[PDB]
Amino acid sequence: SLANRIRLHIWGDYACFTRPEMKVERVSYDVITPSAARGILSAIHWKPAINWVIDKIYVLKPIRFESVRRNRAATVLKDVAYVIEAHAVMTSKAGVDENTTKHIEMFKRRALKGQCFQQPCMGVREFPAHFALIDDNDPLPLSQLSESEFNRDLGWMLHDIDFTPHFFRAELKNGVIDVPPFYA
């Protein structure tokens, strides 16, 4: 539904969504994972009553990498921006009659102020994620993606972990990655 839906514009000069299979040195995935996106949303607003579910990731800027020094080196994304489209689900630990409305409204209110509970980051603590709510009557940023980077098979990527990793087939279709339901 439109009532249970948020859009958050995020950007940063650097990002590192670490690929789990590359163990020698830290190497980022090509785009933000659902896992990292959900972290970013939860940093703005979270309570045990709810879980944020990622629906779409809009990729706005060309995929580019730089090797940078770790305080050792890591290969990280440079100059990223996304839109995260998500909704809330109630957990088994929610109030008997509780709904998503107050949580959606609190998320948006916090986000509009540029406020956050803990600073969101782009995959690793050293890279902060700047953010802006895309409220209902604001437009989506335009993609700056190459006609030829608009559609890309990103391959198997971490969807999320149960603290046990679960992967999904990430496909960029006209600048957007649709994220399937986490559970089987």
Curated annotation (Swiss-Prot):
Does not require a metal cofactor. GO terms for biological process: defense response to virus; maintenance of CRISPR repeat elements. Pfam families: Cas_Cas5d. Its EC number is 3.1.-.-. It comes from the Bacteria. Coiled coil: none annotated. Keywords: Antiviral defense, Endonuclease, Hydrolase, Nuclease, RNA-binding. InterPro entries: CRISPR-assoc_prot_Cas5, CRISPR-assoc_prot_Cas5_N, CRISPR-assoc_prot_Cas5d. Belongs to the CRISPR-associated protein Cas5 family. Subtype I-C/Dvulg subfamily. One of its GO terms (molecular function) is endonuclease activity. NCBIfam families: cas_Cas5d, CRISPR_cas5. CRISPR (clustered regularly interspaced short palindromic repeat) is an adaptive immune system that provides protection against mobile genetic elements (viruses, transposable elements and conjugative plasmids). CRISPR clusters contain spacers, sequences complementary to antecedent mobile elements, and target invading nucleic acids. CRISPR clusters are transcribed and processed into CRISPR RNA (crRNA). This protein is a sequence-specific endonuclease that cleaves pre-crRNA at G21 into mature crRNA. It comes from Mannheimia succiniciproducens (strain KCTC 0769BP / MBEL55E). This is CRISPR pre-crRNA endoribonuclease Cas5d.
